């Protein structure tokens with residue numbers, strides 16, 4: 135059975151995780167894990183309560199690891215236990231993946247050094263200090279690393295992983311069973327297509343978080359430099 | 361504060377719920393509820409464990425009610441307590457909404473009689489016996505009723521509700537903050553675009569469920585006829 139694991143941490147952006155989880159859990163001969171320091175309740179940034187199913191120590195070797203983003207990424211970038219777990223699993227995983235600011239966690243773990251990668255538009259400047267080659271594209275592949283932008287990035291890349299783990303017909307069947315054919319009613323999902331006034335509002339609202347994450351990123355980079 | 365409620369039931373398709381939940385919870389001056397017979401754990405069809413936050417009796421009057429779909433819809437179509445709750449809230453709600461097979465629950469509650477509506481493609485034949493005018497479109501509005509197809513229908517219609525509860529700039533800001541710009545890697549999300557061989561596989565896999573739901577639908581229709 136293919137072993138797929140998601141890191142589930144306090145203040146996760148739950149949709150980053152729950153989207154790909156429901157797609158991948160629809161496949162035959164998969165087992166999906168929600169991983170934290172111990173099994174039990176973990177609260178997402180919205181207040182939604184989720185349950186982790188396994189600890190770091192008990193998690194099986196994973197074929198796919200996925201790091202979601204969220205407010206809680208800042209703490210995870212300086213959590214040595216979590217970073218060590220991610221490094222251990224990434225060494226043998228067939229696919230190392232992240233959604234949105236989850237790639238900053240991969241960066242803090244040292245897994246983006248010399249690699250092409252993306253992250254959420256408001257935090258994109260933090261990739262270069264973590265050793266990455268920053269790329270402004272929605273899904274960026276480099277070897278076995280996939281990084282994606284947007285809260286639903288993992289839904290789309292989960293279909294790619296289904297096609298490569300199984301075959302294209304299986305991915306198409308899952309897409310049809312879920313009737314997945316999005317059609318957003320607005321076109322403001324990128325800073326290049328949203329109105330300038332909306333981009334300004336969004337940037338202002340992210341400014342305090344960006345400032346705090348600049349500080350965290352520099353400390354994380356210092357650890358990689360040692 | 362705008363009061364938004366999702367029905368959370370055993371064997372729900374969790375993404376039907378968790379998608380719109382994370383979008384709507386991003387708005388100012390909203391409160392989001394996860395409603396079941398009592399607060400506590402509810403298991404989705406994938407095994408993901410979610411927590412209901414309020415009971416039917418304690419739920420405040422809702423401005424928006426949303427019924428997700430999933431395997432568990434069949435039981436809900438014959439749950440008199442749940443159907444009565446939905447009818448009570450729908451009487452005063454500004455928006456009555458559903459995702460995928462959640463519209464079959466609205467149908468069983470009597471709320472689609474004479475109304476245009478859609479549902480999941482494999483179960484679309486069950487709308488007419490529940491009194492609906494079946495429509496093959498992804499989002500169907502009739503008055504204050506919105507029904508949508510696809511596992512992520514609620515993400516898209518949540519942006520429409522944001523624009524109508526607040527304004528277009530607020531909806532655009534949420535879209536940009538979430539960097540929401542989907543781009544599926546396959547085009548098999550409708551029976552009209554998927555390969556015929558894939559449609560056959562999907563229809564065969566749904567056949568037992570459709571048969572069982574034909575029986576449930578006829579009993580639900582008999583109750584409406586009384």
Ligand SMILES: [Cl-]
Nearest residue numbers: 284286540541
């Ligand atoms: Cl997206």
Ligand SMILES: [Cl-]
Nearest residue numbers: 314315510512
């Ligand atoms: Cl969809």
